[PDB]
Design a binder for this molecule. Structure first.
Ligand code: CA
Length: 279
């Protein structure tokens, strides 16, 4: 399939070169997979989700996304226009309040929730979780992410927006999950993107157009935006049968565009998420 005039990040993930505008992908499009977006929620009513999104959990007085951040991330995973995996099922877990903040204890509860909740969902092709959040180093937060991964979920987490080594942030620093840095449309490391040995992969993160609350759309930037490209890619690849939850981060690294990003610090992977789709 070909989507013309796609957001640059979608075009990037199906291209051996920057500077193109058509997204190419297998029509299966993540059908039969599931992606949890652990964030401020998802506006499930947004026409862009086509009934494929739903809220499954909140820790606050509402499951509504009163921020937009979670809706944007979910859009990059699986919206019809702005998404990588256009037929995946999206599950919202609201661990962040409408200010975009969340106590680590609530975030941990949300991760353990997903590990159990997948057993209540139909995801024959596999399960992914996208965590566009983080804070300072916490062994408990890392351990929760590790459990989620261990349970059979492909966990993708944001590296962070500190232009610093991600070793000092969680869940970014957890070795067993897929830690995602951000790039821009000219294949530069995004200026805010964290880096370091703990990174596994980069994805498009600067000036990313996606869904927003009130049935709208918005361009924003962050490792929060790169993460759902990788989560959606994993779901897409799992539907194709090319990889599994336990192997998807490795597979994505194996098949990434290599050595093409600029301003990658010595010791950080130079790998850009790529679907290796040949139309
Ligand atoms: Ca990993």
């Amino acid at each position: 399939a070909a989507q013309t005039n796609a957001p640059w990040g979608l075009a990037r993930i199906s291209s051996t070169s920057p500077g193109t505008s058509t997204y190419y992908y297998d029509e299966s499009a993540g059908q039969g997979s599931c992606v949890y977006v652990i964030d401020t929620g998802i506006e499930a009513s947004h026409p862009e989700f086509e009934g494929r999104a739903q809220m499954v959990k909140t820790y606050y007085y509402s499951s509504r996304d009163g921020n937009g951040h979670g809706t944007h991330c979910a859009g990059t995973v699986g919206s019809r226009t702005y998404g990588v995996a256009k037929k995946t099922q999206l599950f919202g877990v609201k661990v962040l309040d409408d200010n975009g903040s969340g106590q680590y204890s609530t975030i941990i509860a949300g991760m353990d929730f997903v590990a159990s909740d997948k057993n209540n969902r139909n995801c024959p092709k596999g399960v992914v979780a996208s965590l566009s959040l983080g804070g300072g180093y916490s062994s408990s937060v890392n351990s929760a992410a590790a459990r989620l991964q261990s349970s059979g979920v492909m966990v993708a987490v944001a590296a962070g927006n500190n232009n610093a080594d991600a070793r000092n942030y969680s869940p970014a620093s957890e070795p067993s999950v897929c830690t995602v840095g951000a790039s821009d449309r000219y294949d530069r490391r995004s200026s805010f993107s964290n880096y370091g040995s703990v990174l596994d992969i980069f994805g498009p993160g600067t000036s990313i157009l996606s869904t927003w609350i009130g049935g709208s759309t918005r361009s924003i930037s962050g490792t929060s935006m790169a993460t759902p490209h990788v989560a959606g890619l994993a779901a897409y690849l799992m539907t194709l049968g090319k990889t599994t939850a336990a192997s998807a981060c490795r597979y994505i690294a194996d098949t990434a565009n290599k050595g093409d990003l600029s301003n990658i610090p010595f010791g950080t992977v130079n790998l850009l998420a790529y679907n290796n789709y040949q139309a």
